Amino acid sequence: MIQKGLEGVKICESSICYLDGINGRLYYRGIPVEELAEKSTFEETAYFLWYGKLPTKSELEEFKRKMADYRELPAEALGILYHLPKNLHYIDVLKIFLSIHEDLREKAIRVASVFPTILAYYYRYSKGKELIRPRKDLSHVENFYYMMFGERNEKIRLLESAFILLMEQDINASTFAALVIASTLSDLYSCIVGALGALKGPLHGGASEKVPPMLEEIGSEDRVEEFVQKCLKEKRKIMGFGHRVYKTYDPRAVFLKRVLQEHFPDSKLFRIASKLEEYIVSNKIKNIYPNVDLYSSVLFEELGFPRNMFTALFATARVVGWTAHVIEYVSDNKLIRPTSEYVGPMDVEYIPIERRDE
Amino acid sequence: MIQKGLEGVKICESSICYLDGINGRLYYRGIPVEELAEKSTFEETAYFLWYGKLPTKSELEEFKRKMADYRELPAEALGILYHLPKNLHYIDVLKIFLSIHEDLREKAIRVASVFPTILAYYYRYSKGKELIRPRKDLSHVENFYYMMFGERNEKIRLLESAFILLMEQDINASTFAALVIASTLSDLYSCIVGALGALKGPLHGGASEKVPPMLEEIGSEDRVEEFVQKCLKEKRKIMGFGHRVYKTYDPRAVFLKRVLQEHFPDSKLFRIASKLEEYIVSNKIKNIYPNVDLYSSVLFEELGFPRNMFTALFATARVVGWTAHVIEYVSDNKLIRPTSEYVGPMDVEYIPIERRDE
């Protein structure tokens, strides 16, 4: 029997996250994701994911100073930056800088802390602007926004909630890629670089970069019905919808939809995305619902980030989940090595080249 | 039920390679791997793996000229090279250069053609030597050896046989990593970079870099018994032995053992490795046998390659298999997204920081 796609296959035991696809609920070590997205911060939730408990006032304070002290890129990395092309995709930029050369958890903390610096530096560089060094007096998210635009805004809160919602979600394709690589006992950077590659795909995190163009292709709320029907006929995948586990609304999508409704109700992109959901759900089209990529992409756009950084923004948060899983998994490691059903030829002879059918 | 490690799980149908773990046989599209390793060449077997048929005289000639025409690194890549640290691991070097920005098969052919150039250039650079540009009048393997050492030797034939033996082997960890990433419809480079990360692990291709040091740790044939017994007591993994599928001798290991016996019988490393096999197999220790990593590593050492390039040498060949699988799989794609058994806490409340247990 072939189990293509591995749907429903449990590849490990985990206490990190419970994904309730039937009721559309997501929990980080027992706490509802929306509670954290609303009441927590990047550092506090990351601490919770890595350490297994909410930090006390002093623990959080010390942890925030730790992450803030890990935001620098080595001097040599900076040298490489100024010799890179200025039109690279941000996911690839991350791969590059992660590939230049308990303790594993300390390593995870450090790599996560530098992600925003890599993105911000490349952004400034690619646009010929002076670099804005990390500020130790700013939080992880505040600082990212500042290294990007040299200013601070209330919108930062919305971005922080978004990161929290995207930090973790069981064994999705990118987390699974990190686990397969981690199962060979390879280094943490290698696991992350593979995860990045998977997250980049249009059938995974990359769908976030495809949504904006799709929404524009639709054009307006009046053209939604026609676009959807066309997609069904052509068997074209509607980006921002569908999921392997959720059999109903994606709680992260619901949360972000509310964010947009409350802060960017007049966004043309949001209006179209909202109408698309209305049509697909009200008509029960394929029994599919919006997934987080539909609204996270719209929020990132409205917050002023480049479209080719959307997947990297997802990674900036999900790196926490990826590393948490790698750490947990290897604590009792098992090489992941499946197989296939052979359907090819048998007993084929090597024919000397001069006797081969012309 | 949990299926940790995915042993025996068929994740797809494939006509590329048949792995007979029970009888210790390996076939590439129906042809025994040792037949190809003995009678074929890198380009001919790669052609066979990608196109599904042995090439005619003219097809092989044209294919060899094609690969030879794809050996150059873009001018910008060269700029980056001279700003990189000189102590990077070769697998990481490959990641870097693959991350700087039918047709998929054409892409696979081009990437495979440049692998040796990346390795040779970094080798020369790291050692402060002048680069030796790819020579279009030389074969894929001949040229690699020449860009590395600026000379041609008969030993090249042994290296070519080794590459052929390592080009492909069903759904191993690195091929699987490439497939997981490929299932999201990510780009070919991303799939390869993830595969590289997995191959690098000590429980996978990386075992090849661990063998030499292990052999030296043993010291001599007289100390083999003591070392093995010690490993059993400490539950230490004996590198170069064991396999998920082979329940007996690894045909590639057998082939390479003969190569060493015929060309480097007096190699101290070979003598130790041979004695290790004798003791483990004759005493039926854990019913394990040598895998290809035991002898491929010894051959690479005797051929004069740096130990931290051994896994990259494996990749130089296996990239053919990785890409062949990606191409085949996505022709009828299916997102790979498993799950886990949740064993963590439930119904946990978010306690305001001021009320948390100090």
CB A182 within 8 A of CB A330: yes
CB B248 within 8 A of CB B289: yes
- Give the C-alpha separation, B327 to B168, whole Å: 14
- Give the C-alpha separation, A298 to A310, whole Å: 10
* DSSP assignment string, A321-357: HHHHHHHHHHTT------EEEE-S--S-----GGGS-
Chain B: give the shortest CA distance to residue A13, in Å: 5
- Give the C-alpha separation, A194 to B196, whole Å: 9
State whether the Cα torsion A291-A297-A303-A308 is positive or negative: positive
> Do the bridges between strand A25-28 and strand A17-20 make them parallel or antiparallel, or are there none, so unpaired?
antiparallel
Contact between A31 and B349 using a beta-carbon 8 Å cutoff? yes
From chain B, pick out residues whose CB is under 8 angstroms from the CB of A6: 6, 9, 11, 336-338
Looking at the complex, does the CB of residue B132 fall below 8 Å from at least one CB of chain A? no
CB B180 within 8 A of CB B186: no
Asked whether the domain spanning B206-303 has the same topology as the one spanning B12-205+304-336, the reply is no
Copy the structure tokens of residue A110.
């450090």
Write out the catalytic residue numbers of B: 243, 293
CA distances from residue B266 to A277, B240, B260 in whole angstroms, order as listed: 72, 20, 9
Chain B: give the shortest CA distance to residue A26, in Å: 11
Q: Please report which residue ranges of chain B form alpha helices under DSSP H.
A: 33-39, 42-51, 57-69, 75-81, 90-98, 103-126, 140-149, 156-166, 173-182, 188-200, 207-218, 224-234, 251-263, 268-282, 292-302, 310-330
Nearest to B300 by CA among B260, B337, B338: B260
Q: For chain B, positions 291-330, list CB contacts with chain A under 8 A.
A: none
State whether the Cα torsion B297-B300-B306-B308 is positive or negative: negative
CA distances from residue B118 to A303, B73, B121, B248 in whole angstroms, order as listed: 40, 8, 5, 36
- Give the C-alpha separation, B348 to A283, whole Å: 36
Sequence positions preceding breaks in chain A, C–N over 2.5 Å: 101
Nearest to A115 by CA among A17, A209, A196: A196
CB A127 within 8 A of CB A350: no
Nearest to B238 by CA among B185, B276, B282, B269: B276
- Give the C-alpha separation, B344 to A90, whole Å: 34
- Give the C-alpha separation, B239 to B202, whole Å: 8
Domains of chain A by residue range:
12-205+304-336, 206-303
- Give the C-alpha separation, B191 to A118, whole Å: 22
CA distances from residue B168 to A233, B13, B46, B114, B143 in whole angstroms, order as listed: 39, 15, 10, 18, 22
Interface test with A, best of B1, B3, B6, B92 (most A CBs within 10 A): B6
- Give the C-alpha separation, A98 to A111, whole Å: 8
- Give the C-alpha separation, A85 to B71, whole Å: 21
Taking each helix axis as running N to C, give the angle between helix B173-182 and helix A188-200, from 0 to 180 degrees, rounded to the nearest 10. 30
Element housing B13 (H / E): strand B10-14
First to last CA, chain A: 39
* DSSP assignment string, B78-117: HHHHTTS-S---HHHHHHHHHT---HHHHHHHHHHHHHHH
- Give the C-alpha separation, A164 to A43, whole Å: 9
State whether the Cα torsion A149-A154-A155-A157 is positive or negative: positive
Name the burial class of residue A254, with classes exposed (0-12), middle (13-18) and buried (19+) by CB atoms within 10 angstroms of its CB: middle
Query: Hey, is B243 helix, strand or coil?
Result: coil
Chain B: give the shortest CA distance to residue A90, in Å: 10
Copy the structure tokens of residue A29.
């070590």
Q: What are phi and psi of A14, to 5 degrees?
A: -145, 140
DSSP letter for A221, please: G
Q: Where are the beta strands (DSSP E) in chain A?
A: 10-14, 17-20, 25-28, 31-32, 339-342
Fold of B12-205+304-336: Citrate Synthase; domain 1 (1.10.580)
The angle formed by the CA atoms of residues A186, A188 and A189, to the nearest 5 degrees, is 105
Name the burial class of residue A330, with classes exposed (0-12), middle (13-18) and buried (19+) by CB atoms within 10 angstroms of its CB: middle
Reduce the secondary structure of B323-348 to three states and give it as a string: HHHHHHHHCCCCCCCCEEEECCCCCC
Nearest to A274 by CA among A311, A220, A210: A220
Nearest to B292 by CA among B160, B192, B197, B163: B163
> Do the bridges between strand A31-32 and strand A339-342 make them parallel or antiparallel, or are there none, so unpaired?
unpaired
Active-site entry in A140, A204, A250, A293: A293
Chain A: give the shortest CA distance to residue B218, in Å: 23
- Residue A341: count of CB within 10 angstroms of its CB: 12
- Residue B223: count of CB within 10 angstroms of its CB: 14
The angle formed by the CA atoms of residues A259, A260 and A264, to the nearest 5 degrees, is 130
Looking at the complex, does the CB of residue B152 fall below 8 Å from at least one CB of chain A? no
CA distances from residue A275 to A14, A268, A287, A294, A302 in whole angstroms, order as listed: 37, 11, 16, 12, 18
- Give the C-alpha separation, B85 to B161, whole Å: 32
Q: What are phi and psi of B342, to 5 degrees?
A: -80, 125
Looking at the complex, does the CB of residue A357 fall below 8 Å from at least one CB of chain B? yes
- Give the C-alpha separation, B217 to B220, whole Å: 9
CATH number of A206-303: 1.10.230.10
Interface test with A, best of B14, B168, B336, B356 (most A CBs within 10 A): B336
Structure method: X-ray
Contact between B18 and A176 using a beta-carbon 8 Å cutoff? no
Q: Residue A223 contacts by C-beta under 8 Å, 6 or more apart in sequence?
A: none
Within its chain, how far is the Cα of A95 from the centroid?
Answer: 14
CA distances from residue A9 to A16, B9, B174, B240 in whole angstroms, order as listed: 18, 10, 20, 30
Copy the structure tokens of residue B352.
């305001």
Nearest to A201 by CA among A167, A172, A162: A172
> Do the bridges between strand B31-32 and strand A31-32 make them parallel or antiparallel, or are there none, so unpaired?
unpaired
Copy the structure tokens of residue B96.
């870097």
- Residue A167: count of CB within 10 angstroms of its CB: 26
Copy the structure tokens of residue B304.
């004069």
